[PDB]
Amino acid sequence: MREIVHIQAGQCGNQIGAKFWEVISDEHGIDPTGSYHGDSDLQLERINVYYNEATGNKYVPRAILVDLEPGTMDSVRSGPFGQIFRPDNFVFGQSGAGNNWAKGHYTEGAELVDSVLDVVRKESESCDCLQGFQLTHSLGGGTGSGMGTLLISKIREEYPDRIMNTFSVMPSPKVSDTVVEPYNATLSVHQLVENTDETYCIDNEALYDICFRTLKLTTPTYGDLNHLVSATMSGVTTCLRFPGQLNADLRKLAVNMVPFPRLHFFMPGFAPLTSRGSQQYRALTVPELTQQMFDSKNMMAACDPRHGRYLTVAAIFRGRMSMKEVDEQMLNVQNKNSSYFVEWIPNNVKTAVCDIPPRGLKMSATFIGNSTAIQELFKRISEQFTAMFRRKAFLHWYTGEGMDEMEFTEAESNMNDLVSEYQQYQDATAD
Amino acid sequence: MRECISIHVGQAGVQIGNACWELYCLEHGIQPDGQMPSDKTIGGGDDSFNTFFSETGAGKHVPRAVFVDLEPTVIDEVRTGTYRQLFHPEQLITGKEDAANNYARGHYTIGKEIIDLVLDRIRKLADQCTGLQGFLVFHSFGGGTGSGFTSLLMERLSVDYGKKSKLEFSIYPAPQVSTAVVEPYNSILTTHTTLEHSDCAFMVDNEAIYDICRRNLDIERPTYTNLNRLISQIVSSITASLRFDGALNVDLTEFQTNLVPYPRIHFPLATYAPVISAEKAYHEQLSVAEITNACFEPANQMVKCDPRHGKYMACCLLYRGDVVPKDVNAAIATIKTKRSIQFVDWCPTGFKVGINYQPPTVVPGGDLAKVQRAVCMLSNTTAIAEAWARLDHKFDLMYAKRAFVHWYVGEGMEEGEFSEAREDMAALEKDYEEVG
Amino acid sequence: DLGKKLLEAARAGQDDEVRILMANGADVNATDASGLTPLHLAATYGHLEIVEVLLKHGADVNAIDIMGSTPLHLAALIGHLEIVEVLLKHGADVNAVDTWGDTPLHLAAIMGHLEIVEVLLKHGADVNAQDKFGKTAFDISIDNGNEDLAEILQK
Numbered sequence A: 001m002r003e004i005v006h007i008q009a010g011q012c013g014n015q016i017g018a019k020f021w022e023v024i025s026d027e028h029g030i031d032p033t034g035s036y037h038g039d040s041d042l043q044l045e046r047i048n049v050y051y052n053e054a055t056g057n058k059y060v061p062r063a064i065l066v067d068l069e070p071g072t073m074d075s076v077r078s079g080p081f082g083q084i085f086r087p088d089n090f091v092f093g094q095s096g097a098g099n100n101w102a103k104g105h106y107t108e109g110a111e112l113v114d115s116v117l118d119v120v121r122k123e124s125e126s127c128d129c130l131q132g133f134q135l136t137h138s139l140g141g142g143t144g145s146g147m148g149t150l151l152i153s154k155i156r157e158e159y160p161d162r163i164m165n166t167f168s169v170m171p172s173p174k175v176s177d178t179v180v181e182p183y184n185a186t187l188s189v190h191q192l193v194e195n196t197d198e199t200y201c202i203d204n205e206a207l208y209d210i211c212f213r214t215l216k217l218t219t220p221t222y223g224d225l226n227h228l229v230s231a232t233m234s235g236v237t238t239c240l241r242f243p244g245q246l247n248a249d250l251r252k253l254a255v256n257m258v259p260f261p262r263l264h265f266f267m268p269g270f271a272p273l274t275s276r277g278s279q280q281y282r283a284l285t286v287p288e289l290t291q292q293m294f295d296s297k298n299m300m301a302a303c304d305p306r307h308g309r310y311l312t313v314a315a316i317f318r319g320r321m322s323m324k325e326v327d328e329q330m331l332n333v334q335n336k337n338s339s340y341f342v343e344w345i346p347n348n349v350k351t352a353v354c355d356i357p358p359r360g361l362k363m364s365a366t367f368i369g370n371s372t373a374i375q376e377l378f379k380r381i382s383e384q385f386t387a388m389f390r391r392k393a394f395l396h397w398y399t400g401e402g403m404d405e406m407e408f409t410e411a412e413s414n415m416n417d418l419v420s421e422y423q424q425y426q427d428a429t430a431d
Numbered sequence B: 001m002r003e004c005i006s007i008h009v010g011q012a013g014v015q016i017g018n019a020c021w022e023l024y025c026l027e028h029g030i031q032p033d034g035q036m037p038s039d040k041t042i043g044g045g046d047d048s049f050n051t052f053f054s055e056t057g058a059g060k061h062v063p064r065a066v067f068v069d070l071e072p073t074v075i076d077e078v079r080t081g082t083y084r085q086l087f088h089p090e091q092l093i094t095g096k097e098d099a100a101n102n103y104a105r106g107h108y109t110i111g112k113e114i115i116d117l118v119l120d121r122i123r124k125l126a127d128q129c130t131g132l133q134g135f136l137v138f139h140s141f142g143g144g145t146g147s148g149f150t151s152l153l154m155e156r157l158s159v160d161y162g163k164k165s166k167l168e169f170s171i172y173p174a175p176q177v178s179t180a181v182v183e184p185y186n187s188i189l190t191t192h193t194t195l196e197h198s199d200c201a202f203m204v205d206n207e208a209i210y211d212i213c214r215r216n217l218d219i220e221r222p223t224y225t226n227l228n229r230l231i232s233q234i235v236s237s238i239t240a241s242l243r244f245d246g247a248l249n250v251d252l253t254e255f256q257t258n259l260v261p262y263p264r265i266h267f268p269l270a271t272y273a274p275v276i277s278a279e280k281a282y283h284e285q286l287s288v289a290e291i292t293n294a295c296f297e298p299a300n301q302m303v304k305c306d307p308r309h310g311k312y313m314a315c316c317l318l319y320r321g322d323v324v325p326k327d328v329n330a331a332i333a334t335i336k337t338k339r340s341i342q343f344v345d346w347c348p349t350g351f352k353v354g355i356n357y358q359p360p361t362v363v364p365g366g367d368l369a370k371v372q373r374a375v376c377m378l379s380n381t382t383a384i385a386e387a388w389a390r391l392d393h394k395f396d397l398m399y400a401k402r403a404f405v406h407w408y409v410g411e412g413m414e415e416g417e418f419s420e421a422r423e424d425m426a427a428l429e430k431d432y433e434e435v436g
Numbered sequence C: 001d002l003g004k005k006l007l008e009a010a011r012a013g014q015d016d017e018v019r020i021l022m023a024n025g026a027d028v029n030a031t032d033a034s035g036l037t038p039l040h041l042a043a044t045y046g047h048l049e050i051v052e053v054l055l056k057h058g059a060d061v062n063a064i065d066i067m068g069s070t071p072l073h074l075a076a077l078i079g080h081l082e083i084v085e086v087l088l089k090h091g092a093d094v095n096a097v098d099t100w101g102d103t104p105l106h107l108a109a110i111m112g113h114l115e116i117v118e119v120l121l122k123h124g125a126d127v128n129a130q131d132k133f134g135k136t137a138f139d140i141s142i143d144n145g146n147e148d149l150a151e152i153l154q155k
């Protein structure tokens, strides 16, 4: 399998999504016009995974840009790589969503979901062996959460034999525009647990605390947060885009990372943590990359992994380094932290090396973990959700769009069950 | 002739077949393009090496091999590598979507889309034979294709070739090399469904080969090319009697006679010695007694176990090189006397000996040094049940909580087969316990 | 009716409608089905002008709905800082309890309204107040890992 059809929905989905394209295009050697000017053959071996090969060496991203308002439409084009997207792949409505999940999932988003499926169906026919779909979106808004989850269900039933992959950014009061974000996020998790195979939880609470407390940026912006998102999205897709000698695709990741169909919410980590332009990270080593990768301060989800147990872990090392020193340092962590990995899944930690490092860094590491400690993210969303829902606050914004009250109690109940499963497998023993 | 068809399934099976057929050509003096100047039989021929190679009218020798994989990545390298001209191009069969380390995909959903093409291509090679005696199947335990498709292929071969033999060369998983999480599952599932369809299966523990490459060959991180060249050196020792004149295991039927007492405990233990690094080219040459002693040391085994903890049911010794038979008998006399090699009381306690007086071949580009004499011991001991226990244990740890089962159920497979395959292994454990 | 109209005008933020209806003798302390007064809805939907107008004309700053929610609960929940201080200026019970045991400090802590948390502490919010599960506002900050809130609750 090879081709991946990328979809980005909503303002946040297109913001972090556009950052993803200008990052991997830089890594593969593509310019805003679509031409290739890199200096390595390994940059072009697995290039069909994200790009289409057009006329004369013109690599076009296999991306589809969705939003319910034309505001973000012109913002992506004016960006550095805005002209490389296929103009026919822009499906933008007129009347926005207004942070209303019901407006994106039932009203304004339903009138546009058919127009998007026609673009996805075209991009799938030009695929030799399609392997799945990748989505970037936020859960706090209305377009990326509401219409995004509706787009997932429509594709899940039209392409059921394909892997559905999401990059779902979680809302937080630290970076909040409204108190209905726990509503929108909870309604989306109810759709993600039943329709996606892999979800990367990029908690805005974690990104803020990294920029505020670790990067010492006293007033973080969306550019600071998205700088961490791009560095994480680039790492988690490294094995998909660069050769190596292992066999990496979305299904082999899901088969190895997801032991239970509902517990498919991964905790991403990255080392070293850097701000936009600082040149600080200069002398990092393998014993340091391994330590920071599992340190709770390098997690893109605000959850302490030492409060739970790892089910499966996939580690990516990038740059020229001693592969011998990688295997011994990884073995070093799985020994001193023996009780942090479940023993009923033997050899649940996978290591990987890649010669090509990300831009601005000579060595790097990317952490992907399926830990039971992710329940702290869902418990935080549930407590905020329950606080709002028990006072029936702003509920008429949602029920006015044909939505029933039982849809909220089910989303509350289903997410409580999700936390119950993590706690269930956190206390399970071998014996 | 009594031809033999080799089938290679999955990445492990294909890459191992690459090193085996590369070495086979060097032993028989065959060029990469298929030309053999030595034996000057025009076409067809009737020498012993024709059991593995067919002969065209233009003097080209084409291996009787089939390479199958559900994704084209690995086989495409064989189509463009050094031996791109060697094999039959129509016997290099690929799909587009691998089994994703899933037995169910390899056997059911994905494997069904190519199984009839593989059998028609196998039938094409089978009809090129005057007296086909069976198949040699190379595959992995943990791979989706190597476990699922191989079990599917072995079930179909028994229907189409009821009287023909089937020998396995299986790769036992090991945490050092790579492996997926669900490899204990795939190993148990493919063993349950292939047990009745296989006459003799040679397990190759990746951890055993890994430890030999680091201790004996001084390799820090052994690559797949390092492991395979060492495994192909051992496969060549097992199949040497099929490709040359011999008196021990001259055909696939004789393997079951000499190594398999009962059709269920058909997993012989292979031991190869000596393994000497190519950097030590001017090494002292070990005697026949020294290399024979090294066959009863745990470090030289292909499956990690302890034969001293178990009983022997059969034992064949396959020497290669400057090996005088009188020195073998003296070596066996010293093994039987000083060492406590307990046999079961219902089998002949005699060692079967076969000697190939050709020096062992090593591939240029390998890590092995040339030796005057090598030996591969094929023994059927009950101690190899420990290897099944290690697989059964990892299976039970995951299946007790039904981990990863949904990936198999959602690919045309019922959950009951998990309980069937495990109970079949628990019966295989009981068989080794009751034998001795 | 005039009661229902003042309730809907206080929710939608119709400033002149509130002044007109109040002129026609509309009940400032009218209640809907769940016991919400115009002051509850004004504090919930962030209409600071209507809050001060209602308080000037006999609005009960400590009225409770069916669930025991006071206007200060809802203002602390949604995150309207100025409304919180206007409510506190007119004598709002900073330690009022609803049917879930939540105090205004609990709701502002769960929703991460750090500035409102600081104001409630200045006005004597009980730091030892527990909800029905026994959790205080500091217990909530430790359970969710909100370092910023925990430092505030320890000033």
Ligand SMILES: Nc1nc2c(ncn2[C@@H]2O[C@H](COP(=O)(O)OP(=O)(O)OP(=O)(O)O)[C@@H](O)[C@H]2O)c(=O)[nH]1
Pocket: A247, B009, B010, B011, B012, B013, B015, B016, B069, B070, B098, B099, B100, B101, B102, B140, B141, B142, B143, B144, B145, B146, B147, B171, B173, B174, B177, B178, B179, B180, B183, B206, B224, B225, B227, B228, B231
């Ligand atoms: N000795 C040896 N073992 C290998 C080699 N390649 C893969 N393996 C082993 O095979 C196991 C995985 O099975 P694969 O053969 O790679 O999988 P597959 O048969 O191609 O089926 P898929 O899951 O569809 O890819 C791993 O545990 C490896 O240890 C090889 O070249 N030599």
Ligand SMILES: Nc1nc2c(ncn2[C@@H]2O[C@H](COP(=O)(O)OP(=O)(O)O)[C@@H](O)[C@H]2O)c(=O)[nH]1
Pocket: A009, A010, A011, A012, A013, A015, A016, A097, A098, A099, A100, A138, A139, A140, A141, A142, A143, A144, A145, A169, A170, A171, A172, A175, A176, A177, A181, A204, A207, A222, A223, A225, A226, A229
């Ligand atoms: N990390 C990150 N988060 C964002 C960005 N833009 C918006 N968000 C978050 O997304 C939520 C708002 O959703 P949004 O995408 O704007 O609404 P939508 O257009 O309907 O999908 C808020 O909680 C924001 O914190 C961004 O550029 N980066």
Ligand SMILES: COc1cc(CCc2nc3ccccc3s2)cc(OC)c1OC
Pocket: A235, A236, A237, A238, A239, A240, A247, A248, A249, A250, A252, A253, A256, A257, A312, A313, A314, A315, A316, A347, A348, A349, A350, A351, A352, A368, B179, B180, B181
């Ligand atoms: C190691 O990094 C990766 C591995 C895979 C699949 C294989 C796995 N085997 C195991 C074994 C144990 C635990 C987890 C796994 S994932 C796919 C990846 O990207 C699509 C990838 O890059 C992140």
Ligand SMILES: [Mg+2]
Pocket: A247, B010, B011, B071, B098, B099, B143, B145
């Ligand atoms: Mg494969």
